[PDB]
């Protein structure tokens, strides 16, 4: 009847409008806090951009196409709403992409590659993915029906024409879906596993603030900490203390001997008793009284919470989060996009056997992805969640 016609009205026009001022809420918090502008987050904002087209046109023009089971726009307003509907929403699988990319590359390659990442390259980047966008689907979409010489879409309804076939329908998907699913995958599985993934060289590169060095650089900081290594195995009261030590309390102790040095380390010793004793607890609480902890805090803190625990819980802190905040991404675009995708799979092997409903609903399901990923963001990143605040 049109008691469930309004219902779905009702759902339709709610996920349009939050998806709107979910996304117009992330802009906003993007233009006015300066401090939200990094690298990462600069992606994040071509994310936003494709899904406030989404849900302030696609969401609009797909509701009303349910609704009166027409198309009632015209042929040019279906061909732009196709054209609106996939170029910005490849461009948004695209920056999942490069968000991967950009992610893959910290953790592999630390050296040439974490201090490339410029504000410049990262905004070159989401004008290649719009504009490639651009040239692969809009002359297909606008343009195809004049090559052929006739429009087969009938008047009445509204698909892509040069997508017709599903053996064509089924290549765009493994190569605009299925691969660049399978890459993430790929990555994010190789990001979480390396976390820790954590040794000595950037234990010392995060409190010293430090930046990758060239390659002579690193082997000059190999021969600093070897040379540390050995002068702590001649010190007699550093000798004792150190072969205590576990292999991540050890770094701990190379990172006051490369600060203070052998002998300023030395001076320590009701705390390297204790640490010796392995009374942990009451090490860290003796550490944080010293005139070391008040020089440099941070750096001690560090240190400190790494002989207390053990770990390296306190050196992983924003690439645990970084990668937490990519899982939810990806595991937000590969739930909603699947089954639409899936169904493309069957549709190439069959005729009749998938109903309309079921493409409308799996249409409808990537539509929702717009609307969980604002939500992404302030789910993670405890910064968003203060911008918005504020807004
Ligand atoms: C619901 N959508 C509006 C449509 C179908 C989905 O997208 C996808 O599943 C597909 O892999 C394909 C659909 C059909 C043949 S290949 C992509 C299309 C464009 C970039 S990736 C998600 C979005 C996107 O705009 C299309």
Same mark, same amino acid.
């Given at each position: 009847t049109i008691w469930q016609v309004v219902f779905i009205?009702?759902?339709?026009?709610?996920?349009?409008?939050?998806?709107?001022?979910?996304?117009?809420?992330?802009?906003?918090?993007?233009?006015?806090?300066?401090?939200?502008?990094?690298?990462?987050?600069?992606?994040?904002?071509? *994310? #936003?951009?494709?899904?406030?087209?989404?849900?302030?046109?696609?969401?609009? %023009? =797909?509701?009303? +196409?349910?609704?009166?089971? &027409?198309?009632?726009?015209?042929?040019?307003?279906?061909?732009?709403?196709?054209?609106?509907?996939?170029?910005?929403?490849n461009a948004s699988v695209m920056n999942l992409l490069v968000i991967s990319f950009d992610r893959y590359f910290s953790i592999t390659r630390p050296l040439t590659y974490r201090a490339k990442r410029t504000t410049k390259r990262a905004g070159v980047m989401i004008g *290649? #993915?719009?504009?490639?966008?651009?040239?692969?689907?809009?002359?297909?979409? %606008? =343009?195809?029906? +004049?090559?052929?010489?006739? &429009?087969?879409?009938?008047?009445?309804?509204?698909?892509?024409?040069?997508?017709?076939?599903?053996?064509?329908?089924?290549g765009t998907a493994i190569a605009a879906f299925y691969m660049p699913v399978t890459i993430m995958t790929i990555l994010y599985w190789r990001i979480?596993?390396?976390?820790?993934?954590?040794?000595?060289?950037?234990?010392?590169?995060?409190?010293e603030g430090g930046g990758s060095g060239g390659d002579e650089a690193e082997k000059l900081f190999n021969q600093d900490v070897d040379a540390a290594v050995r002068g702590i195995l001649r010190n007699a009261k550093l000798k004792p203390v150190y072969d205590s030590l576990d292999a991540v309390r050890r770094a701990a102790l190379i990172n006051m001997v490369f600060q203070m040095g052998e002998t300023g380390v030395a001076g320590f010793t009701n705390s390297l008793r204790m640490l010796q004793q392995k009374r942990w607890d009451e090490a860290?609480?003796?550490?944080?009284?010293?005139?070391?902890?008040?020089?440099t805090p941070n750096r001690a803190k560090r240190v400190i919470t790494t002989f207390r625990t053990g770990t390296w819980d306190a050196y992983l802190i924003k690439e645990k989060k970084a990668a937490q905040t990519l899982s939810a991404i990806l595991l937000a675009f590969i739930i909603t996009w699947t089954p639409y995708n899936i169904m493309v799979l069957v549709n190439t092997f069959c005729d009749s056997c998938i109903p309309k409903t079921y493409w409308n609903l799996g249409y409808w399901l990537c539509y929702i992805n717009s609307t969980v990923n604002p939500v992404c963001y302030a789910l993670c990143n405890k910064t968003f969640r203060t911008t918005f605040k504020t807004l």
């Open positions: 009205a009702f759902l339709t026009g709610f996920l349009a409008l939050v998806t709107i001022i979910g996304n117009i809420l992330v802009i906003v918090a993007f233009k006015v806090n300066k401090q939200l502008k990094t690298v990462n987050n600069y992606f994040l904002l071509s *994310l #936003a951009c494709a899904d406030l087209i989404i849900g302030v046109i696609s969401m609009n %023009l =797909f509701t009303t +196409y349910i609704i009166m089971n &027409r198309w009632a726009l015209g042929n040019l307003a279906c061909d732009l709403w196709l054209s609106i509907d996939y170029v910005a929403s *290649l #993915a719009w504009v490639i966008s651009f040239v692969l689907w809009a002359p297909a979409i %606008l =343009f195809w029906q +004049y090559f052929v010489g006739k &429009r087969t879409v009938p008047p009445g309804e509204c698909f892509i024409q040069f997508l017709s076939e599903p053996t064509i329908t089924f979480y596993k390396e976390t820790e993934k954590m040794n000595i060289f950037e234990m010392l590169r995060i409190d860290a609480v003796n550490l944080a009284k010293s005139r070391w902890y008040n020089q």
